[PDB]
Design an enzyme around this catalytic site. Structure first.
Site, PDB file in Angstrom:
ATOM      1  N   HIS A   1      70.054   4.062  46.649  1.00 29.60           N
ATOM      2  CA  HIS A   1      70.364   4.565  45.308  1.00 29.60           C
ATOM      3  C   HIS A   1      71.276   5.759  45.281  1.00 29.60           C
ATOM      4  O   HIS A   1      72.016   5.976  44.312  1.00 29.60           O
ATOM      5  CB  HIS A   1      69.038   4.947  44.627  1.00 29.60           C
TER       6      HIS A   1
ATOM      7  N   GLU B   1      74.020  22.103  57.989  1.00 32.85           N
ATOM      8  CA  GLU B   1      73.990  22.845  56.751  1.00 32.85           C
ATOM      9  C   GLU B   1      72.667  23.510  56.476  1.00 32.85           C
ATOM     10  O   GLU B   1      71.604  22.999  56.805  1.00 32.85           O
ATOM     11  CB  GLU B   1      74.352  21.863  55.583  1.00 32.85           C
TER      12      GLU B   1
ATOM     13  N   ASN C   1      72.687  26.682  53.802  1.00 32.26           N
ATOM     14  CA  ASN C   1      72.850  27.197  52.434  1.00 32.26           C
ATOM     15  C   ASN C   1      74.040  26.503  51.808  1.00 32.26           C
ATOM     16  O   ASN C   1      75.173  26.638  52.298  1.00 32.26           O
ATOM     17  CB  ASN C   1      73.068  28.711  52.497  1.00 32.26           C
TER      18      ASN C   1
ATOM     19  N   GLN D   1      76.938  29.087  50.664  1.00 27.37           N
ATOM     20  CA  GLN D   1      77.433  30.122  51.572  1.00 27.37           C
ATOM     21  C   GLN D   1      77.877  29.521  52.894  1.00 27.37           C
ATOM     22  O   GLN D   1      77.310  28.537  53.381  1.00 27.37           O
ATOM     23  CB  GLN D   1      76.361  31.183  51.871  1.00 27.37           C
TER      24      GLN D   1
ATOM     25  N   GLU E   1      78.144  24.554  60.068  1.00 22.83           N
ATOM     26  CA  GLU E   1      78.420  23.264  59.470  1.00 22.83           C
ATOM     27  C   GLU E   1      79.536  22.457  60.138  1.00 22.83           C
ATOM     28  O   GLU E   1      80.537  22.986  60.643  1.00 22.83           O
ATOM     29  CB  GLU E   1      78.888  23.453  57.997  1.00 22.83           C
TER      30      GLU E   1
ATOM     31  N   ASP F   1      65.189   0.532  49.412  1.00 20.25           N
ATOM     32  CA  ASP F   1      66.025   1.676  49.096  1.00 20.25           C
ATOM     33  C   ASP F   1      66.426   2.435  50.349  1.00 20.25           C
ATOM     34  O   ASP F   1      65.864   3.462  50.754  1.00 20.25           O
ATOM     35  CB  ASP F   1      65.335   2.581  48.061  1.00 20.25           C
TER      36      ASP F   1
ATOM     37  N   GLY G   1      67.828  14.957  43.889  1.00 21.14           N
ATOM     38  CA  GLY G   1      68.689  15.610  44.876  1.00 21.14           C
ATOM     39  C   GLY G   1      68.045  15.596  46.281  1.00 21.14           C
ATOM     40  O   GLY G   1      68.729  15.968  47.240  1.00 21.14           O
TER      41      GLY G   1
ATOM     42  N   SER H   1      66.334  12.785  47.242  1.00 19.60           N
ATOM     43  CA  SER H   1      66.478  11.382  47.579  1.00 19.60           C
ATOM     44  C   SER H   1      67.417  11.151  48.762  1.00 19.60           C
ATOM     45  O   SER H   1      68.449  11.781  48.905  1.00 19.60           O
ATOM     46  CB  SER H   1      67.066  10.590  46.393  1.00 19.60           C
ATOM     47  N   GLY H   2      66.993  10.204  49.638  1.00 23.24           N
ATOM     48  CA  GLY H   2      67.828   9.877  50.805  1.00 23.24           C
ATOM     49  C   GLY H   2      67.358  10.610  52.057  1.00 23.24           C
ATOM     50  O   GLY H   2      67.747  10.229  53.184  1.00 23.24           O
TER      51      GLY H   2
HETATM   52  C1  LIG Z   1      65.817  11.262  44.458  1.00 23.55           C
HETATM   53  O1  LIG Z   1      66.274  12.371  44.472  1.00 23.55           O
HETATM   54  C2  LIG Z   1      64.821  10.773  43.412  1.00 23.55           C
HETATM   55  C3  LIG Z   1      63.777  11.822  43.226  1.00 23.55           C
HETATM   56  C4  LIG Z   1      63.193  12.345  44.530  1.00 23.55           C
HETATM   57  C5  LIG Z   1      65.508  10.440  42.137  1.00 23.55           C
HETATM   58  C6  LIG Z   1      66.562   9.417  42.268  1.00 23.55           C
HETATM   59  N1  LIG Z   1      67.799   9.623  42.969  1.00 23.55           N
HETATM   60  S1  LIG Z   1      68.722  10.887  42.372  1.00 23.55           S
HETATM   61  O2  LIG Z   1      68.282  12.112  41.698  1.00 23.55           O
HETATM   62  O3  LIG Z   1      69.550  11.093  43.534  1.00 23.55           O
HETATM   63  C7  LIG Z   1      69.759  10.093  41.152  1.00 23.55           C
HETATM   64  C8  LIG Z   1      69.339  10.083  39.839  1.00 23.55           C
HETATM   65  C9  LIG Z   1      70.142   9.470  38.901  1.00 23.55           C
HETATM   66  C10 LIG Z   1      71.333   8.886  39.292  1.00 23.55           C
HETATM   67  C11 LIG Z   1      72.205   8.218  38.262  1.00 23.55           C
HETATM   68  C12 LIG Z   1      71.736   8.908  40.615  1.00 23.55           C
HETATM   69  C13 LIG Z   1      70.945   9.519  41.566  1.00 23.55           C
HETATM   70  C14 LIG Z   1      64.509  10.040  41.082  1.00 23.55           C
HETATM   71  O4  LIG Z   1      64.685  10.438  39.887  1.00 23.55           O
HETATM   72  O5  LIG Z   1      63.524   9.328  41.377  1.00 23.55           O
HETATM   73 CA   LIG Z   2      76.606  26.411  54.104  1.00 21.26          CA
END
Ligand SMILES: *C(=O)[C@@H](CC)[C@@H](CNS(=O)(=O)c1ccc(C)cc1)C(=O)O
Ligand SMILES: [Ca+2]
Length: 240
Positions: free
Chosen positions: A45, A59, A61, A64, A69, A93, A186, A188-189
């Site tokens: 995703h 990475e 910070n 900064q 990096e 996923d 943010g 995620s992944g």
């Molecule tokens: C991942 O961060 C996850 C929560 C832990 C997110 C989904 N992925 S995301 O925030 O990277 C994202 C959200 C919306 C879009 C269009 C693209 C990426 C979650 O809300 O479950």
């Molecule tokens: Ca940095």
């Protein structure tokens, strides 16, 4: 990461920042795990949009210069072929990113150790989530890498009616759910690191949280279970 603490800068050397080009600069969008010197494991995703991506290893910070990096472009994106953007709850996923150049390993940049295929953790096993994701529901990304202790919630409990019900599959790992600590947008992944036989291994790829919010009691953060995908990962790296 909601309710995290700042990680030491050499604690999680396989964590990467996956960023996209935005005007004249770059923006963090997701985490990832360095698994080969030229391969990153992340969530499918995270690469759904048609963006220009780069990976930052070493990475700490995001706002900064850390003096550690290494920046590399993404040459090829291989999403699991069963992934569907309309159904995150179906699973699959996961995605592998082939880097344009091989990165150099050091105390800030290391390969993530992956569990053996099929490994399932006992309920309440010790894990840490790491990432630069939001520090509060509807908040802002972290500047410094954060970590939070999220003990696993096994399949039986996690797929129970009061937790995630049928939304959680056995190809996923659940962790946390205490209402205080959690992954957030943010993260995620990125990795879910779990301590097994003395060694931390990356058992999860952060995938989703509740639509209600990040730190929701009985809605533990949900991760793709890495140990369900070892053959898939080996097959991609071998044929690419
Ligand atoms: C991942 O961060 C996850 C929560 C832990 C997110 C989904 N992925 S995301 O925030 O990277 C994202 C959200 C919306 C879009 C269009 C693209 C990426 C979650 O809300 O479950
Ligand atoms: Ca940095």
């Amino acid at each position: 990461v909601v309710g995290g603490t700042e990680a030491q800068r050499n604690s999680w050397p396989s964590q990467i920042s996956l960023q996209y080009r935005s005007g004249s600069s770059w923006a963090h969008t997701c985490g990832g795990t360095l698994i080969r010197q030229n391969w990153v494991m992340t969530a499918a995703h995270c690469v759904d949009r048609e963006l220009t991506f780069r990976v930052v290893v070493g990475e700490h910070n995001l706002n900064q210069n850390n003096g550690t990096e290494q920046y590399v472009g993404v040459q090829k994106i291989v999403v699991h072929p069963y992934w569907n953007t309309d159904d995150v709850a179906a699973g699959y996923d996961i995605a592998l990113l082939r880097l344009a150049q091989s990165v150099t390993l050091n105390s800030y940049v290391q390969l993530g150790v992956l569990p053996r295929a099929g490994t399932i953790l006992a309920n309440n096993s010790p894990c840490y989530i790491t990432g630069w994701g939001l520090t509060r529901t509807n908040g802002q990304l972290a500047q410094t890498l954060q970590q939070a202790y999220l003990p696993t919630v096994d399949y039986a409990i996690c797929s129970s009616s009061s937790y995630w019900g049928s939304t959680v599959k056995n190809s996923m790992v659940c962790a946390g759910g205490d209402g205080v600590r959690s992954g957030c947008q943010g993260d995620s992944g990125g990795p879910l690191h779990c301590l097994v036989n003395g060694q931390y291994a990356v058992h999860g790829v952060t995938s989703f949280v509740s639509r209600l919010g990040c730190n929701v009691t009985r809605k533990p953060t949900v991760f793709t279970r890495v140990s369900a995908y070892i053959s898939w990962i080996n097959n991609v790296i071998a044929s690419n």
